[PDB]
C-alpha cells in the first residue's frame, strides 16, 4: 500500500547508499516512522545503549502470541540494513547501525542536525487561503489533465514526460490525445497520500542523470515530510540540485514559492500529508434504472465519474447521470476493468444505500441464518450488468504467434509439442489434428531448436 | 439545557445511605408464552437473555463479593439454571444455554419465589438477600396462596425488585411493597429500549 512501497524502494537501495542516507537526522526519523511497532520498540530501546544487544535477549522480549511478528520485524531490520549481525562466542550478536543511531539520537535530544529540518524565516502567509489553495490548484490541474477533461491551463512538460514514461497514462501522437490506462484509474482510486508516494517513487525511478543526486532527493522528500505548513524556510541550506527539484515540486504543488528562484519556500499541506493520513462530496446513489445521483461539486469527482457515466444534468449538489452501455464501453476501451468500477461505486456509496443494505441483510439473517452474505451496498443488477458489459468486450481473446503442423510422424510432433510445453510458450496442441500453437515471443526459441 | 438542568436536578438527592455490600442476588427471568411477544426487538425472550448477560457482567464487575443465582419460570415451573455462586462465567454459560431454548408456558410467580426462598435460606445474616424478577406476562398461575409466600419472604428479610414488561401487575406491586418495607419504588416498568437498559443498569447498585 503505502509503507510497503517505500519499504520495497528502500530495499532496492544499495547498502553504501543506504548508509550515506543516514547522515541527515530528518531522513532517519522519517524512515524510523515507517517501521513496524515491534521494530520501532527494539530500535528505540537499542539506540540509547552503546553496547551491542544479543538476539536471544530480543527473543525474550516478545510473548509467544506475537513471536512471528517479531521475526517479521527482524526481517525488516534484515532488509533495511539497520541491524548488523556478528558471530561472537557462539552467539548471533546484533549491533545497531552507527550513523543511523547517531542521527536518531541527534534528532531526539537535539544538537548537530546540519539544518536537516531547515530554518524558519518567520515570514508567513495563511495556509488555508494560499498554501492549501496552491497545492489543491496544482493537484487539480494535473488530475484534470490526466483524466482527459479539457483545460485552459495545462501543466508543464516536466510532468508530461513523467506521465509519458510512467506505466500509467499512455500517450499517442497520431491523434493528439492522452489515453488513460488501467493503472491510471487505479491511481484515481486510492487516497492522495499514497498517490503522492507513487508519483514520487516513479520520479525517483526516472532520476539517473548527473544533474540530480538520489540521496539529496531522498533527504529533501523526507525533510519536506518533516516540514510544517504555515511557515516558510530558507533556500540557502539546499544545494542547486535541491533548488531545481524544489522548483520542480513548486510546479508539482508540494511546495509554494512567491516568485521563481525566491530565497524562501512555503511548504504545503501535501508535504505533511506525505508522511501519514491526518455525507462527503462525491457520494453517489445507484438505482435499478442505472441512474447515478452523485453528490459532487468538485470538478475532480465529476471528471472521474464522466469516464464511465453518461452525464445528463449538473446541479450544485449532485450530477444527474446514467450508467449506459456506451459509457461503460468507453471505460473498458481504456482498460479500466469492471472490478475497478465496482470498487469505485462501492467506496463512494451513499449512507442511505448502506442503511438499506443493512436492513435487507437484517431481514435476510432472520430468514436464513444458516448462511451469511456480504453487505451488497449497491444493487446486484447493476453489478451484474457491468460485469456483463466487461464480458461482451472480451468475448474473443486474440493470441498471435505461430502454428506448426504437417508432421509425417507423430513422434516428431510429440517431441516439438513437449519442447514447447517445457519452454512454456505452447497454448494448444492436438495429435489428432497434428497441430500445436506457440506465442509470438516463443517463436524464435522453437525456430533455433528446429534449425539446429 | 433546561431539560439538562431537570436531569441535573434529579441528581441533587445525594445521601451517604448505608447499603448492603455483600449481596445474594437471585435473578428470575420469565420464559413464558408472553416472552414470545415481538414488541421488543427481535423477540422479548432473546433481548432479556442478552441484557441479563450484560447485567451479570456489570453486577460481577461492580459487586465482586456478591453471589448470584439464575432461575427461570417455564411451563408453570421454576427451573434453576445456575446455582448461587460467585463465578460469573457459570452464569454466562447458563444464560447462553437458555438463549437457545424456546420460551413457553404460563409463568408461576409463587414457584419462583419458593425456589428463591429455598436458595436464599443458607445465605448468612450479613449477606443481604435480594431477588430480581424480570416478569414479562400480565397474569400468573400459582399452585397455592401467593400471599403466604409473600409473608414468608417478608419474615426472612428477602427484598424483591420486579421489572415488568407490559403493565403494572397488582401482585408484583404488593410483593415489592411488602418486601421493601412499604417502598413502592421497587416496581419498575420500562418505556422503550434504552429504558430497559437503564433499569437493568440500576439494579447493579446495592
Amino acid at each position: 500500500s503505502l509503507k510497503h512501497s517505500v519499504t520495497q524502494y528502500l530495499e532496492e537501495i544499495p547498502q553504501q547508499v543506504q548508509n550515506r542516507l543516514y547522515t541527515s537526522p530528518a531522513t532517519c526519523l522519517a524512515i524510523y516512522r515507517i517501521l513496524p511497532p515491534l521494530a520501532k520498540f527494539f530500535i528505540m530501546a537499542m539506540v540509547f545503549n552503546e553496547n551491542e544487544v544479543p538476539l536471544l535477549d530480543l527473543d525474550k522480549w516478545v510473548n509467544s502470541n506475537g513471536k512471528l511478528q517479531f521475526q517479521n520485524a527482524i526481517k525488516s531490520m534484515k532488509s533495511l540494513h539497520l541491524l548488523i549481525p556478528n558471530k561472537s562466542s557462539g552467539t548471533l550478536m546484533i549491533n545497531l547501525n552507527p550513523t543511523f543511531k547517531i542521527s536518531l539520537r541527534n534528532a531526539l535530544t537535539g544538537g548537530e542536525v546540519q539544518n536537516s529540518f531547515g530554518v524558519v524565516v518567520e515570514e508567513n502567509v495563511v495556509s488555508l487561503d494560499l498554501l492549501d489553495e496552491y497545492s489543491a490548484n496544482k493537484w487539480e490541474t494535473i488530475l484534470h489533465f490526466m483524466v482527459g477533461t479539457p483545460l485552459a491551463k495545462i501543466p508543464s512538460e516536466k510532468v508530461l514526460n513523467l506521465l509519458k514514461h510512467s506505466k500509467l497514462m499512455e500517450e499517442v501522437n497520431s491523434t493528439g490525445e492522452f489515453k488513460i490506462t488501467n493503472e491510471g484509474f487505479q491511481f484515481l482510486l486510492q487516497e492522495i497520500n499514497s498517490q503522492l508516494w507513487t508519483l514520487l517513487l516513479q520520479y525517483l525511478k526516472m532520476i539517473e542523470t548527473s544533474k540530480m543526486d538520489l540521496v539529496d532527493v531522498l533527504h529533501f522528500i523526507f525533510m519536506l515530510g518533516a516540514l510544517e505548513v504555515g511557515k516558510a524556510y530558507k533556500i540557502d541550506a539546499l544545494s542547486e540540485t535541491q533548488r531545481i527539484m524544489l522548483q520542480d515540486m513548486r510546479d508539482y504543488g508540494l511546495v509554494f514559492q512567491k516568485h521563481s528562484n525566491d530565497s524562501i519556500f512555503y511548504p504545503t499541506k501535501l508535504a505533511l500529508m506525505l508522511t501519514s493520513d491526518t455525507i462527503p462530496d462525491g457520494s453517489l446513489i445507484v438505482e435499478t434504472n442505472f441512474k447515478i445521483y452523485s453528490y459532487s461539486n468538485s470538478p475532480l469527482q465529476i471528471a472521474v465519474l464522466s469516464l464511465f457515466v453518461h452525464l445528463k444534468a449538473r446541479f450544485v449538489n449532485m450530477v444527474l447521470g446514467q450508467i449506459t452501455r456506451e459509457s461503460i464501453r468507453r471505460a473498458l476501451t481504456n482498460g479500466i476493468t469492471a472490478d475497478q468500477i465496482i470498487a469505485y461505486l462501492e467506496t463512494h456509496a451513499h449512507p442511505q444505500m448502506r442503511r438499506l443494505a443493512e436492513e435487507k441483510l437484517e431481514k435476510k439473517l432472520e430468514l436464513d441464518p444458516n448462511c451469511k452474505e456480504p453487505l451488497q451496498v449497491l444493487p446486484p443488477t447493476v453489478v451484474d450488468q457491468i460485469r456483463l458489459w466487461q464480458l461482451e468486450l472480451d468475448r474473443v481473446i486474440t493470441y498471435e504467434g505461430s502454428l506448426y503442423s504437417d508432421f509425417e510422424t507423430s513422434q516428431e510432433y510429440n517431441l516439438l509439442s513437449k519442447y514447447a510445453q517445457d519452454i512454456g510458450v505452447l497454448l494448444w496442441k492436438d495429435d489428432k489434428k497434428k497441430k500445436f500453437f506457440i506465442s509470438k515471443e516463443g517463436n524464435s526459441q522453437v525456430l533455433d531448436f528446429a534449425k539446429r | 439545557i433546561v431539560e439538562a438542568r431537570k436531569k441535573r436536578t434529579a441528581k441533587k438527592n445525594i445521601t451517604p445511605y448505608q447499603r448492603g455490600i455483600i449481596r445474594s442476588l437471585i435473578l428470575t427471568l420469565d420464559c413464558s408464552e408472553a416472552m414470545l411477544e415481538k414488541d421488543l426487538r427481535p423477540n422479548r425472550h432473546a433481548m432479556i437473555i442478552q441484557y441479563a448477560i450484560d447485567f451479570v457482567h456489570e453486577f460481577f464487575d461492580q459487586n465482586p463479593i456478591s453471589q448470584m443465582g439464575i432461575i427461570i419460570m417455564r411451563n408453570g415451573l421454576a427451573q434453576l439454571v445456575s446455582q448461587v455462586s460467585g463465578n460469573p462465567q457459570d452464569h454466562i454459560d447458563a444464560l447462553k444455554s437458555i438463549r437457545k431454548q424456546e420460551p413457553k408456558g404460563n409463568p408461576s410467580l409463587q414457584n419462583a419465589l419458593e425456589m428463591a426462598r429455598g436458595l436464599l435460606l443458607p445465605v448468612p445474616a450479613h449477606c443481604t438477600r435480594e431477588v430480581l424478577i424480570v416478569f414479562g406476562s400480565l397474569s400468573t398461575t400459582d399452585p397455592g396462596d401467593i400471599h403466604q409466600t409473600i409473608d414468608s419472604l417478608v419474615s426472612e428479610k428477602i427484598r424483591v425488585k420486579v421489572l415488568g414488561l407490559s403493565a403494572q401487575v397488582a401482585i408484583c406491586k404488593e410483593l415489592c411493597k411488602a418486601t421493601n418495607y412499604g417502598d413502592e419504588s421497587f416496581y419498575k416498568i420500562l418505556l422503550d429500549e434504552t429504558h430497559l437498559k437503564e433499569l437493568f443498569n440500576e439494579a447493579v447498585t446495592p
Partner: protein, 65 residues
C-alpha cells in the same frame, strides 16, 4: 513443420459460427478452421473483425434513445 503468419483466437461456438460468414463475405478473414473453439484469423484484419463483431452483435442489443 511449416510456419505461417496468423493469430489464434478463442471463442464460443456462436462467435465461431458468426465469423465464418465473415469469411464467406470477405475472403481474407480466416485461413483455416482448427476446432469448434479455436480459429486462425489473419492478424492484418483482426481489429477489423473486432470492428465488425461489435457491429455484428449490435443487432442483438436494444439501445434506448
Amino acid at each position: 513443420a511449416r510456419a505461417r503468419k496468423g493469430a489464434l483466437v478463442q471463442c464460443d461456438p456462436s462467435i465461431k459460427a458468426l465469423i465464418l460468414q465473415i469469411d464467406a463475405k470477405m475472403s481474407d478473414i480466416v485461413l483455416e478452421e482448427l476446432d469448434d473453439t479455436h480459429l486462425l484469423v489473419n492478424p492484418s484484419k483482426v481489429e477489423f473483425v473486432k470492428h465488425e463483431l461489435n457491429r455484428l452483435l449490435s443487432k442483438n442489443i436494444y439501445n434506448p434513445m
